[PDB]
């Protein structure tokens, strides 16, 4: 469960560092990931977004 | 013209001269005569033919272009299509007008020049044996039969042969 899954989490942390201007660092239709320091996919559209963090 | 021969110190042309553009008329002991000069005629003809061939040289071949007549009002793009073609036509019309005006001015001047060159060349042959009467004619101060006139027209006239005779008539 710490694979794919690691890229999804760091993608969420990087988008957070952009939106909130913070500087976190990753430690370890929807994906619900609990991480230490809510992701949607629509494969026909090629969309990936972090609805909640 | 710039050189003052044709329509200048030569009063008019000879309609009777039908075998050349420039030539000689003479009066001597054997009568009168007329003969065209070949070199000066050919030099003027060569320059005009070269100029003429340069102008009528086929140099324009176009295929698919823009439309130039319109059946409906369209506004902006049609305004530009008409303006582009109107601009082109005016620039080429100017080119054509200026070209013929420059060419014709030069053609009149070069043919005047050829007449003046032939006149200067003839007086240099005669040296001190003749005088320029101011109307394109030389008064020759010695006996000069038909063979003598021909020697002037074909460029073999030896002025020293007649110089003593000519100087005596000229200055006493």
């Amino acid at each position: 469960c710490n694979t794919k899954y690691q890229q999804l989490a760091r993608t969420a942390v990087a988008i957070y560092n952009y939106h909130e201007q913070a500087h976190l660092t990753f430690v370890e239709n929807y994906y619900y990931i609990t991480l230490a320091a809510k992701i949607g996919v629509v494969e026909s559209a090629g969309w990936t977004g972090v609805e909640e963090f | 013209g710039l050189f003052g021969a044709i329509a200048g110190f030569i009063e008019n042309g000879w309609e009777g001269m039908i075998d050349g553009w420039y030539g000689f008329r003479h009066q001597n002991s054997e009568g009168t005569g007329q003969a065209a000069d070949l070199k000066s005629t050919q030099a003027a003809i060569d320059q005009i033919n070269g100029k003429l061939n340069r102008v009528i040289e086929k140099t324009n071949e176009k295929f698919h272009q823009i439309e130039k007549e319109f059946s409906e009002v369209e506004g902006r793009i049609q305004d530009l299509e008409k303006y582009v073609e109107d601009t082109k036509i005016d620039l080429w019309s100017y080119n054509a007008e200026l070209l013929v005006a420059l060419e014709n001015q030069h053609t009149i001047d070069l043919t005047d020049s050829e007449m003046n060159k032939l006149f200067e060349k003839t007086g240099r042959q005669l040296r001190e044996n003749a005088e320029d009467m101011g109307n394109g004619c030389f008064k020759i101060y010695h006996k000069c039969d038909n063979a003598c006139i021909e020697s002037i027209r074909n460029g073999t006239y030896d002025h020293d042969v007649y110089r003593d005779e000519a100087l005596n008539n000229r200055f006493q």
């Binding site: - | 295929f63 698919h64 030389f138």
Partner: protein, 316 residues
């Protein structure tokens, strides 16, 4: 007792007036005309291949208007459009008509190659009495009128790749019904849609429903569009109603071809230069006949005469 030797130049009794830098008119012995201002009034059929459209515009011969069937797979260097031409098929219009007429004229051919499109779930080959081919109903020869089959009109989604080494020109259309009853009777869906795309471009057209003026008994229309598919690209057509489908592609060429509007008759003669007034010789560098020309032509100027002096000053 001596001799006199006079130098002179010739003269003529019939001088010609010419323009110079200083003189508006001055007499020389000889001149030549530089502006071609007359025409036989006929278009010579050599050495250019002339295609006489007669009753047909280029677009109508492209689409396949029945009385333009004779122009199938034709080629030309110059297509000549007559003012008496008329359409006699389904009433239509072409957004950017001028561009489509231009690019086909410049291509110089109507070479059509039928392709095996599969239209699953629809009725093909719709026709019209406003477009008779023979005594019975018909349609544009290069277009395919699709309608419902049974009680459904599915989402059409076909693909045609271009594996050849030339460009393909696809002509297609959208049907604009006059009433909502007409729309649902033909295409079931209350609102149609046509999406034509390649990897490099896409077009989506939404039909328009409403009352137009009658043309040959009909208030509905077909709107013509076009798509070019480059070698290695692929055509995808997607629609849930109102698609006037292509049957294939037109082969595209580059070259010297064009189109001209003229009512001048065509004759068996030789002339490199063509104008709407007819062919004109091209020995002179300028011409006053028409600003529209095709071939090796004198340049158009406003003056109807320009005399070039070819002799000395004439002093009789």
């Amino acid at each position: 007792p001596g001799a006199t030797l006079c130098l002179g130049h010739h003269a003529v009794p019939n001088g010609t007036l010419v323009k110079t830098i200083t003189d508006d008119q001055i007499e020389v012995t000889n001149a030549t005309e530089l502006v071609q201002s007359s025409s036989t009034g006929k278009i010579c059929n050599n050495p250019h291949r002339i295609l006489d459209g007669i009753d047909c515009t280029l677009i109508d011969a492209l689409l396949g208007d029945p009385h333009c069937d004779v122009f199938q797979n034709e080629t030309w260097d110059l297509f000549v459009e007559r003012s008496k031409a008329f359409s006699n098929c389904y009433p239509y219009d072409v957004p950017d008509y001028a561009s489509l007429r231009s690019l086909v004229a410049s291509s110089g051919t109507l070479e059509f190659i039928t392709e095996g499109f599969t239209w699953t779930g629809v009725t093909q080959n719709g026709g019209s009495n406003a477009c008779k081919r023979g005594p019975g109903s018909g349609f544009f020869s290069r277009l395919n009128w699709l309608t419902k089959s049974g009680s459904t009109y599915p989402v059409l989604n076909v693909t045609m790749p271009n594996n050849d080494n030339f460009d393909k020109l696809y002509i297609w259309g959208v049907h604009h019904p006059s009433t909502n009853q007409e729309q649902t009777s033909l295409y079931v869906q209350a609102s149609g849609r046509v999406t034509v795309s390649t990897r490099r471009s896409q077009q989506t057209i939404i039909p328009n429903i409403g009352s137009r003026p009658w043309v040959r008994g009909l208030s509905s229309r077909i709107s013509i569009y076009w798509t070019i598919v480059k070698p290695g690209d692929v055509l995808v057509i997607n629609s849930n109603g109102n698609l006037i489908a292509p049957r294939g592609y037109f082969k595209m060429r580059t070259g010297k071809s064009s189109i001209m509007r003229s009512d001048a008759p065509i004759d068996t003669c030789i002339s490199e230069c063509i104008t709407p007034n007819g062919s004109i010789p091209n020995d002179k560098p300028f011409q006053n006949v028409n600003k529209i020309t095709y071939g090796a032509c004198p340049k158009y100027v406003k003056q109807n005469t320009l005399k070039l002096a070819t002799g000395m000053r004439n002093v009789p």
